[PDB]
């Protein structure tokens, strides 16, 4: 259809995958579905794939991407652990994650913004390594560490570019210290805002 894909909501599960596609005609624009996943305390992983965005052309099928909102159980808790460790995205509009157990984000395709929050845990976190595997990713806007600003963000960010070029329009990580870009294919960061950086280290081929 050209009429837009209606919500998708998931609650609970050991692992969640929601895979949208868009198959609209060559001169139309379909805008895709808003996704919400809310883990229960078994939810280790979440994946939210969509069809890549494109501009409606003569022979180009047009797609806009849906917002994604991922939330762990213990996102609002001061003490409870949190279980969502890995999140995979494959294109996205205004995406959010909120998990104190988050270590890995896998990115892919066409994105608008990712905001990463960690759970409102009051305890000072000890493991603070964001692994950020990219592959064919392009971003309109910012990957932000929303937690770093007023709370305890990631100190070391690792970006592993893989099998295709990636371009992050903006990377905002106010508590970041080390930044290591690794792997297999070009990673481009058009603009970082990471005032506390003491080193950047490319190891990428």
Partner 1 sequence: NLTNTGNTAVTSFDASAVTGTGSAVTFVSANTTVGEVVTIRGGAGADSLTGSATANDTIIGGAGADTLVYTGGTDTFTGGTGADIFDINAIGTSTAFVTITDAAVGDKLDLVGISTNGAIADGAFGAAVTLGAAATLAQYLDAAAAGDGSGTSVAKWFQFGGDTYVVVDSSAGATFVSGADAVIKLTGLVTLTTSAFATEVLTLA
**Site residues for partner 1 per CB under 8 A:** 126-127, 129, 155-156, 177-178, 180, 198-199
User: In the bound complex, what is the minimum distance in angstroms from residue 195's beta carbon to Ca ion?
Assistant: 11
Alpha carbon distances (Å) from 204 to 111, 133, 184, 186, 188: 22, 12, 6, 7, 11
User: In the bound complex, what is the minimum distance in angstroms from residue 114's beta carbon to Ca ion?
Assistant: 15
Q: Are 116 and 144 in contact (CB under 8 A)?
A: yes
Q: Which helix (H) or strand (E) holds 187?
A: strand 187-189
Q: Which is nearer to Ca ion, 160 or 173 (CB)?
A: 173
Q: Are 157 and 136 in contact (CB under 8 A)?
A: no
Q: Which is nearer to Ca ion, 26 or 76 (CB)?
A: 76
Residue 7 binding partner per list partner 1, Ca ion, none, with a CB distance cut-off of 5 to 8 Å that depends on partner kind: none
Residue 178 binding partner per list Ca ion, partner 1, none, with a CB distance cut-off of 5 to 8 Å that depends on partner kind: partner 1
Residue 54 binding partner per list partner 1, Ca ion, none, with a CB distance cut-off of 5 to 8 Å that depends on partner kind: none
Residue 120 binding partner per list Ca ion, partner 1, none, with a CB distance cut-off of 5 to 8 Å that depends on partner kind: Ca ion
User: In the bound complex, what is the minimum distance in angstroms from residue 127's beta carbon to partner 1?
Assistant: 7
Q: Which is nearer to partner 1, 34 or 145 (CB)?
A: 145
Q: Which residues of the chain form contacts with Ca ion (CB under 5 A)?
A: 117, 120, 151, 175
d(CA 134, CA 160): 6
Q: Which is nearer to partner 1, 103 or 188 (CB)?
A: 103
Sequence-ordered list of residues with C-beta below 8 angstroms from that of 92, at least 6 positions apart, any chain: 48, 50, 65, 66, 67, 68, 109, 110, 111, 112, 114
Nearest CA to 2 among 47, 48, 56, 76?
Answer: 56
């Amino acid at each position: 259809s050209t009429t837009t894909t209606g919500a998708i909501a998931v609650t609970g599960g050991t692992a969640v995958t929601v895979a949208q596609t868009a198959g609209n005609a060559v001169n139309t624009t379909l805008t895709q579905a808003d996704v919400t996943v809310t883990g229960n305390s078994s939810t280790t992983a979440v994946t939210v794939t969509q069809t890549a965005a494109a501009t409606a052309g003569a022979t180009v099928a047009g797609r806009v991407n849906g917002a994604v909102t991922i939330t762990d159980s213990a996102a609002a808790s001061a003490t409870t652990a949190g279980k969502i460790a890995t999140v995979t995205l494959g294109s996205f509009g205004a995406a959010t994650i909120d998990s104190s157990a988050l270590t890995t984000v896998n990115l892919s395709g066409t994105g608008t913004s990712l905001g990463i929050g960690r759970g409102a845990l009051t305890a000072t976190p000890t493991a603070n390594t964001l692994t950020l595997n990219v592959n064919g990713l392009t971003t309109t806007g910012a990957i932000t560490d929303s937690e770093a600003a007023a709370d305890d963000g990631f100190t070391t960010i690792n970006i592993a570019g893989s099998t295709a070029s990636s371009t992050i329009a903006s990377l905002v990580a106010a508590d970041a210290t080390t930044l290591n870009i690794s792997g297999d294919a070009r990673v481009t960061i058009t603009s970082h805002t990471a005032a506390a950086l003491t080193g950047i280290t490319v190891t990428n081929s």
